[PDB]
Design a protein around this ligand. Structure first.
Ligand SMILES: NC(=O)CC1NC(=O)C2(CCCCC2)NC(=O)[C@@H](CC(=O)O)[C@@H](c2ccc(C(C(=O)O)C(=O)O)cc2)/C=C/C[C@@H](Cc2cccc3ccccc23)CNC1=O
Ligand SMILES: NC(=O)C[C@@H]1NC(=O)C2(CCCCC2)NC(=O)[C@H](CC(=O)O)[C@@H](c2ccc(C(C(=O)O)C(=O)O)cc2)/C=C/C[C@@H](Cc2cccc3ccccc23)CNC1=O
Ligand SMILES: NC(=O)C[C@H]1NC(=O)C2(CCCCC2)NC(=O)[C@H](CC(=O)O)[C@@H](c2ccc(C(C(=O)O)C(=O)O)cc2)/C=C/C[C@@H](Cc2cccc3ccccc23)CNC1=O
Ligand SMILES: NC(=O)C[C@H]1NC(=O)C2(CCCCC2)NC(=O)[C@H](CC(=O)O)[C@@H](c2ccc(C(C(=O)O)C(=O)O)cc2)/C=C/C[C@@H](Cc2cccc3ccccc23)CNC1=O
Ligand SMILES: NC(=O)C[C@H]1NC(=O)C2(CCCCC2)NC(=O)[C@H](CC(=O)O)[C@@H](c2ccc(C(C(=O)O)C(=O)O)cc2)/C=C/C[C@@H](Cc2cccc3ccccc23)CNC1=O
Length: 96
């Protein structure tokens, strides 16, 4: 499990300066959080800036960027038109 995407204590500013010069949107790194001891931040090139996400943890110690839950069945459906419903195959929802 190589982690060439991990850049340790790279400051937020330097991560932005590095990601700015990348050719593709989605170019990214993970780095230690600026403020939170033991936490990680994900930095991603998107168009003409760089977005930062906190790498969230739950009580079981799992890692995630947002909790994927929906307010309506329709919302669930709309999501899985473009994100697979299967955990092992590529299967998108399509109108019957
Ligand atoms: N990186 C991956 O894609 C790995 C797996 N994850 C999935 O397919 C995923 C994530 C991507 C989108 C589809 C759903 N998620 C899951 O399957 C899930 C569960 C699910 O139903 O979606 C993942 C999981 C279970 C429980 C928690 C929970 C907790 O630990 O208390 C919590 O809230 O923190 C969290 C996550 C189960 C893994 C068991 C896995 C089976 C398993 C593997 C190795 C060891 C054990 C040991 C015990 C039980 C099961 C396993 C199935 N899941 C995967 O292999
Ligand atoms: N996984 C995610 O980041 C999803 C969220 N983020 C967003 O909605 C985003 C998604 C990218 C586009 C802008 C909006 N990002 C942000 O809002 C932000 C905004 C930003 O970039 O300033 C994201 C963030 C804050 C600060 C850092 C910082 C550090 O960790 O000390 C660093 O650069 O190392 C990094 C990231 C804030 C999270 C606060 C979050 C609250 C929070 C959660 C857990 C621990 C702490 C701890 C302290 C403060 C807040 C939190 C709310 N935001 C989100 O959950
Ligand atoms: N959650 C995961 O599955 C990630 C890792 N775990 C493993 O592959 C596993 C997990 C179960 C089977 C044995 C090997 N574990 C390990 O490799 C290891 C260690 C090992 O040989 O078991 C994992 C580790 C280090 C130290 C502790 C712990 C203790 O020693 O009691 C403590 O509190 O210090 C616990 C775990 C090292 C991680 C660094 C990793 C390298 C690393 C170092 C520093 C920063 C980063 C940042 C991002 C990714 C990886 C790293 C190697 N380990 C992994 O990638
Ligand atoms: N719990 C502790 O306080 C002692 C450990 N942790 C630290 O000192 C810490 C404590 C908070 C602030 C930064 C320094 N944390 C860390 O070092 C780190 C990473 C860091 O720089 O923040 C800890 C770590 C690695 C990877 C993950 C990873 C995963 O499990 O997938 C993830 O986040 O998803 C998570 C944590 C690395 C352990 C390797 C350890 C070295 C190591 C041991 C055994 C096998 C391998 C194998 C490969 C690389 C490193 C190691 C170093 N860390 C520690 O022993
Ligand atoms: N993780 C916890 O919160 C505590 C668990 N305690 C245990 O007894 C354990 C402690 C380690 C030694 C074996 C048994 N853990 C487990 O049962 C399992 C580990 C195990 O070997 O059975 C634990 C677990 C699941 C999946 C993974 C997986 C992943 O997330 O990708 C992976 O290995 O990569 C890792 C760990 C969680 C299961 C769901 C838990 C139930 C659950 C909650 C929320 C959503 C789902 C969704 C699907 C299935 C189960 C759940 C039952 N397990 C536990 O409560």
């Amino acid at each position: 499990k190589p982690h060439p995407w991990f850049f340790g204590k790279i400051p937020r500013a330097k991560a932005e300066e590095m990601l700015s010069k990348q050719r593709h949107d989605g170019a990214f790194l993970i780095r230690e959080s600026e403020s939170a001891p033991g936490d990680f931040s994900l930095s991603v090139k998107f168009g003409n800036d760089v977005q930062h996400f906190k790498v969230l943890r739950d009580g079981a110690g799992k890692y995630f960027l947002w909790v994927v839950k929906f307010n309506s069945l329709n919302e669930l459906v709309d999501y899985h038109r473009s994100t697979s419903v299967s955990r092992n195959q590529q299967i998108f929802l399509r109108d019957i």
